[model samples]
Every structure is written in structure tokens, then in C-alpha cells.
Target: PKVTDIANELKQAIDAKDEVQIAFIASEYSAESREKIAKAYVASYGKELPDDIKKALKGGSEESLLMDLFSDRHEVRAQHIRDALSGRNDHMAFFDTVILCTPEDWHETVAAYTRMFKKPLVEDFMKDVGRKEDWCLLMEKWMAHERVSRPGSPEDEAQRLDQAFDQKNTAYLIDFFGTVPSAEYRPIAEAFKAQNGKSIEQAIATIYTKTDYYTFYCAHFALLGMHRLAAYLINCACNDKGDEKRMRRITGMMVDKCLGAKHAYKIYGDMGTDIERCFDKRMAPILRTLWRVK
Candidate 1:
């Protein structure tokens, strides 16, 4: 169907508060087509589709699924944060947004969050995660850190990291990640392998040994590239006893950022299963449906 036709249907669905029909539209539509309908929706109906959906749908899996259909990266992030902030506080989603966001995108995301929620993102952060604690402090540092390429040898940094891990030095580890740009992590990872004969991920695994600090380093890998996050999802969803909240948040992120739909599908296939096979039953079906799974 033409985008205009879909927009008309969407408008009617929203006007009628037909959430089932709206979800049907979301499930059937591709991201590109959904985006087209979003634009056409604004032109034809003289209202923003997101605003209409927000008004029509209550916050939950359905609302999140519809929100994911849009191409607005910043708004999508903000929506996830809103979801994370609400309910029982999905700290996994909160950290996922903060860690995966690039420097430039963070500003846009903050702007969208403030605009849509009518409060500063920092205010929300302070309310939820602002207390004096290791996690809070690290999160604050991560957000405040000026991410830029610094003059340093990957080999030296790699060695330093190795030693830091050996010593279990939290201070240096935090400083290293805080100072290093996301772009530099790949080279450092390679250098770690070259010098140590093991991946930095492995090094983190051995040294951190299932600590929260380990998860923190995994976030570093996530910002470096999506593979770590993908593996984390597989590990959490498939290998372990399936954390539904974490899986949904991470899967939604995979759809939003990289490995959109088919790539994630392919990766799961390569891993000897599908997301459908491994996904936690609760939000899995709807999240997968929203993600353009084939």
C-alpha cells in the first residue's frame, strides 16, 4: 500500500484508539515504510505520528514496539530511556543507552529526552542513578568524559590494561576507559591480542570473573563495536536462564543501532538458532516482531 494510505489507516487507528490495529500496522511495516508513513502522517494528518502514538498507546511493550518503528535515532533512545526510567527501573536499558551512545549523538539524545519528557535527562539520571555508589560514579564519569583520540601507543595502553587487570586496579581501568575514545578501542583490542595472545574480552573474562566490573568492560566493547553486545544478548538470552528485561532492551537496541533485523537474524542463525528459539517468551515475540525478524 502507498504510504499515504497507511498513514490514513494509522490516523484512524490512533483516533479510534485501536491498539491491536496499530500493532498490526507496526508488525507489517518495514522500518523504511514505517518511516515513510511517519512523514506522510505528519503531512496528511497535520500531526506527528509519534505524538499520536504516545497519546493513544499506554507505556509498555506495545508502546515501545510502535516507538521502535521510527527512524528518529535520538527519539528512539529517549523513548527507551523513558521506558527504562518508568516501571521498576530497567537499569540495564539505562546503561545500554548511556554506553552505546556516541559523543555527538548523546547531545541529540539529551535534547530529545528533555524535549519529549519535559525535564533534563540529567535530572532523571540524578533522581534514579545519582546516589554515591560505584555504579553511579562510573556512569557519571562515562557521561562526562570528553571522548577524544589521545596520543598513546596501543601497545603501551594494552600492556597497561593487562597489568591493570592483573592487579585488579579499578582506578586505572576506569581512567583508561574514561579517557580513551571509542574509535581507539579496536586498535587496543588488537594490540592486547598481539602482546598477550588473548583477546581483551578474554582478558576481561578471566580477570573480572563475573563481577559487575566485568559487565562494565563489556559495555566498553559494545561502544567499540556491536559484536560484544550481540554476544552479551546471546549469552544472557540463550546460554543463561533468559533475562527478559535485559533481552528486550538489548534486542531493541540492536534493532535501533546496528545489526538491524536481518543481520541480528543472521547472527543468531550462525550461532545455531534464531532469536525466536532463544528469546525469553515474555516480550520476545513482540520485540522480535517489531524488529523486522524474518
Candidate 2:
């Protein structure tokens, strides 16, 4: 159906306060398509679609999930960054968003960040958080461009990675990551394993501590496309003390990116339970339905 048609159905559903129909429309359309439908809604109905949906839903986990599904992914990424910086000061949200953003979408998210916030994302980070934080070094370097302009030769890069691990050189590892693209992580990991006989995750865990460990570990698994590990991380985030926002952000991205198909179940198998077990009571039903776990 045309976006105009989706817009029409969405308007009717919102007006009727039909949660099921609203959810169906939300899930039925891809995020890319939903943005178009949102425009069509404004054109045809002369009302902001999201505002109407929010008015009807009256705000809840359902609203959160629906809003995320209906918005452009880049816009969502930008919003997460803004939410983190603007008084929320949720530094991990900033870290997680940057880590998970595909290289393809990095510039798009950066552009969106600037457009939405009226300043460069890098500038905001520098002013609000500054480069003194070790992870800020990586984030600042990343925000400057989409990916490393010239990645070092993979063989040599792998050797350097091994050298860094042996010497416990956090600076070398961070600098290397700041330059390498996320897609390169898998090949680098393969080369590291073939040459060094250990996973990059192990090397990262062995050296980095606290937030550095969490950042590098997640970045390795996330960049390497290890969805099961991503799933496991989300499970830990959910079960740990009070990271519901992070859980929601990660879980939403995982399902939106279709990581729930195989890897989600694999994590469940490894953990002796499904991903739904990780959600808090408020979001368990809503997010579980999104993951189709029940």
C-alpha cells in the first residue's frame, strides 16, 4: 500500500485509540517507510502523526516502542545522543549509540545530530564532556568522520594489535579503534586470532578496566557483528541495577536490525532462558511482543 494509505490507517487508528491497530501499523511498516508515512500523514491530515499517537497512547513503554519504530533510525540515534547530553547526562547512552551506529549511518546520524541540535555533535561532546575522558578520545575521533580514511594494512594492524595487547597499551588500542571502521573489526579479529591465538574480546577484557572495559568489550562484539554477544550484553544490562533506558535502546536496535532472528534465540539457549526473561515488568510485555519471543 502507498504511504498515503498507511497514513490514513494510522490516523484512523490513533483517533480510535486502537492500540492493537496502532501497533500493527507500527510493526507493519519499516522505519524508513514510516518516516514517509509520517510526512503523508501531515500532508493529508494536517496534524503531526507522532503527537497524535502520543496523545492517544498517553505515554508508556508501548508509546516508546511505537515512537521508536515510527521514527527514522538516524533521528533516533541523534535523539539518544541529545537525551544523553541534555541534562540526562547518560554517558553510556552516548557510548552505546556511537558504538552501534553503522558506518553507513555515521555521517547521516552526525548530520541529523547537527540539524537537530544546532551544533556539531563533536562540538557538543567537547563542550559538555570534554576530551579528558578516555572514551571521549575515541568518540571525538569517531565524530570527526564516518570511518578511518586509511586503515593500516590488516596484517600489520593485527600485529600492532597483538603488540598493544602484550604491552597492555590502552592508548594504542584506542587510537587504532578510532581509525578503523566497524566492519574492519571482524577481519581484524580473524587475523588477530590466526596470528595471536586469542579473541580480540579477550585482549580487550584483559587490559581495559571499568568504563573502558565496558566500552571496548561492547565495541568489539558490536563492531564484529557478534549479535549473540550483543544480545548477552543487553540481557546483562536489563538484569543489572537500573539501566532500563539502555536496555530499551539496545533491544530496539537489535530487533530493528533483525538481530533477534537467530542470535537472540542462541543467547536464550546459552542462558537457559529467552530474552524476555531479561526485561523489567513494565517493558516485558511490550518489548517481548516486539521481539516476538512469546
Candidate 3:
């Protein structure tokens, strides 16, 4: 069937809270299409479809599944927040879930709620939770997918390193090297070798060829820690005024890496307060997203 025709049917199923039909149709539609349908539902009903489903289902298993589908998109999640701010009590349950669970779970809960009610999750949260630090931390964790894992044996480390290599998730390696102390770097290095048959140094030496990337990695590896790296990168980028894009990229990388890192957070806090001279307006959105103070 044509996409539009299928979407219309899906919209009808969602509006009617037909769990089976919505589930079947949800599987066929792309995330973007689902978001469009969700928005359309809100426009037509003056209330979020996901919230409506949650109300209709009232503690049914299908509610969980629907929430997952809706929360997948950041836009939907944001809208749910908007709804919550407007006193949609059901959304508060979603906010509580996000605060208490892993990001993946939070996303699922929010999405399901969005699909049921047809409102954005974040907007509601913002209104209910306001600009509290805990809320900001929750947002950062959910957006960045930060979650703890169970305790694992040495083999687990090896397996993770292997997966990282396969995925080229170099940021993980950078994080490890940046945070682990110099004395501990050797054991971690040994673990990486055991898993990937190559040294962490070798991985660093090969993957980081861009001068700025190399410099950032080297500063991270210097054992002085992320604060030092942040300072060095910021200074280098700021000094090279002609390289605005390059500077922004490096600074942005620093911001991304340092969000939850203790020392890095402190550094970022200082930079945000003291270094107003170095920033441009382009970074305002990211800064607001992170610190919410600008």
C-alpha cells in the first residue's frame, strides 16, 4: 500500500486506541512517520494521543509498548513535557519513571505516554519540574544515554573492548584514558590488548590523525586528567582565532565529554562563568541544553 494510505490507517488506529492495530501499524511506519502521526493527533484532538491511550488502557500491557514507540523521538518526548506543564497528571508518572530508571527505560515510558496522549514529553516535564538541577541531570542522562551496568569479570572488559573496536566507538576509549589514572592506565591497556590483540596506545596512534583530535587525545593521555585537557583545548582553540570552526568543534567535544565528569564539570562551570569573551552565539543552544543557564 502507499505510505500515506497506510499512515492514515495507522492514525485512525492510534486515535481509537486500538492496541493491536496500532502495534501492527507502528511496526510498519518509520519513526519520523510516527512522529508526524503523533503531531497530527494532537492537532486534531487538542490533547496528546499517547496520554489518551494511557488513559484508555489504564494499566494495560499495551500502554508500555505504545509509550516506547512515542518516546523514541526527542520531539515527542519534548512535547510530553509541554503537556505535563499544562497539568496533565498522567505525564508526571512518565517524569518519575525517567528520573528513577535508565535512559532507555525512560525513553520507552515517555514514548508510550506520548503515543497514547499525543503530547510532547519534555515540555510537560519542563513545566512540572521547572529548571531544577536534578531535572537537568535527568535530561542529560536521558539524552546522552548514560546508564550503569552490572558488575562484570575481566572477560567482560575484553568483550567490551572488542565491541568498541568493531563499532569504532573511539569516544569510549578516549573517556577511559582520560579518567583512569596513569598507574591504572597500564592495567586497562593490558585489558584492551587481551581483548583486541592491540594496545590502547596503538588504537590511539592510529585512529586520531586529525591534529586537534590527536592533541586532545594526547592531552587526555598526559595523566593530568580531563581538566587539563579542557584547559589546553580551550586555550589552543581560542588562540587560533582564524580557526573558528575548528575551535568550536574542539570546545564542543570538550563540552560533550565533560557533562557528567566531575572534574570536567567543574572546569566547564568555570569556563562558562569566566570565559564569556571566547564564546559565539552558535553554542548557545548546546550550552542551554547542557547547563540551561545561558
Candidate 4:
């Protein structure tokens, strides 16, 4: 009764010419009706609603909004947003996922998106990367395979790895070596800890890093049959620094050291990817030209 009576007076004040009188009337009912009449005043006066009301009204993100709309009970609502936006925007969608993803969701988020797009099959690039895909692909195989294969001698391989570690040349380690089996990676992990007082994963930080490795490491999971250990490395499909954008578009690019052209791309849409990371620096002039041309 008290709340309603005060509001009725405030309601009458709303019709008054003096805005201060209306505020004073609202101030009297401030206990319970402050929020109540703020909303009412917005409704009656055609004024902008306050931020608090807008937040309460919004309640959720677009992702959450669709869940209530379709009465969703499953993962489909999220996929629906991804599909609607990416399907709406195409390659830009992939960029959005990459830039928006943190390490926690990076693996699963990309796993779903990658499967959605069409790409060159194993037959397309497999033979080309066959032996090259394995740890044997390294210039000095024993550098990373100190324990497993010992292409030369354990002492010699250890010497080389130690020299690199002792000298702190992380770039050569990242640039010169690829992944090997678990047993092979262990002694190197130990040696890395001994030398730098850091884990192997930590060692790669100086080598530069990106979120795209999430996709490629999964691709390599098949290389190791998706062992939980494979989780340590990013899937090696295609990766870069990262990008975030609007819409739901998808496209991919990968480099082929053996290819005559040196760069390759796989795309779902005939329209082409939003931008080629490999050539983005090179593409910028024409990109600006295209922006203005449109």
C-alpha cells in the first residue's frame, strides 16, 4: 500500500510540468519504488531507460538469448550462432572463433569449426608430407630424438641438444625440430628443465606462438592416435598469431615448403577467404584498393 500510494503520487507528478517536483515525488517513494518508478517514468515520459534496467532486460548474450528463444537444451544453440553468423559471414567466422578463443576453449572450438569446412583430403597433401610429416622430417633428427632413434649417437645428440639449450637458442629448437614420440621427448624435456629451469612447453614461448596450433595439433593427434599426450602440443593443421571478427565465415590456408607456389589454401566458399595471412602484408595495398573500390 505504501509503495503503490507513493508511486500513485509520483505517477501524478510525472504529469506535472516541474521535473524537480517529479524527482522529489520519486525521492519520497525511494525505498521500494525507485527502480519501479524509474522504469515507469521511462515508459510514460518516453525517456531513455537507465543502464541498470537495460542490463536487467538484456539478461544474456546473443548465445544465451537463442537458448531461451528456441527453448534449447543442447549444444545446438551455440552451434546455431556459429553457423548462422559464419554461414552469414563465411571466412570471417573462422577469424572470429580464432581471435575470440582462449587456450581453455581453443581446442574444442576449432575442432568443431574445422570439421564444418571442406578441405583437401589426406590424399591431397599426404604423400607430399608423408615422411616429411613425422619427426623424421627434421634436419637433424636426433636433435629432438635423443633417446628414441639416436640417428647418430646418444652422446652426440645430447651434446647438440645441450649446446642449443646451454646457448639458449630457442628459435633453432623450434625451427629445426618437429615432434617425436613420447620417450624421445622425455629426455629432451628433462634436459630442457635442467638447462633453462623450464618445461618444454614453456621453452617454446621465446619461439613465438599462436592459437591456430590448436587445429594443427589435433591433426597430429592422428599422428599419435589422439593420445591425451597430444594435448600438450597444438594441432598442427594451420595457425597464426590469431584474428577476431564479425559474422560466421570460414576459410583456411597452409604453407607447403615443397610447392612451386609455396602457399596453399582450402576454402568452403567459392568467394575466397577474407584475407590470406601469408600474404596479408603483401595483400594490404590491394585490400585497401578493394575497400575503396567497393
- Predicted model with the maximum TM-score: 2
Per lDDT, the best of the predicted structures is: 2
lDDT of 2 at 278: 63
TM-score of candidate 1 relative to the true fold? 0.71
Q: Rate the local accuracy (lDDT) of all candidates.
A: 0.66, 0.68, 0.46, 0.31
What is candidate 2's lDDT per residue for 1-294, written digit by digit as tens? 888888989888888977657766765665667778889988897887777887788756557666666666777788888888889457677656777666666678778888887888767767887767567676676566545633566667788888989997868777777767766766777888888877787887777777767767766666666464456566656567535677667544545565443455464463223445665555555555555444
Tens digits of per-residue lDDT, candidate 4, 1-294, equal 554454445445433433334323422332223545545545654653233222323332322221122121112223532453433323223222332222223334334444544432222222332343222233123222232343544344545655665576644443334434435444644555565555444443443234323222322222222222111211111133222112111110100001111111122211123333312343222222221211
Ordered from best to worst TM-score, the candidate numbers read 2, 1, 3, 4
Q: TM-score, each model?
A: 0.71, 0.82, 0.29, 0.25
Worst 10 residues of 4 by lDDT: 248-257
lDDT of 3 by residue, 1-294 (tens): 655465457567756756656555555455556667667666666767567666655443235445545444443334434443555433223322332233443566467657766755556555555543322333333433433442354456545655665677755554443334444444545676776766655665665554324433443333333444445444444455523433323322233333333234354445454334454443323233332223
Give the C-alpha miss distance for residue 30 in model 4, angstroms.
66
Whole-model lDDT, model 1: 0.66
Worst lDDT window (10 residues) for model 3? 91-100
By summed lDDT, the worst window of 10 consecutive residues in model 1 runs over: 256-265
Number of the candidate with higher TM-score, 2 or 4: 2
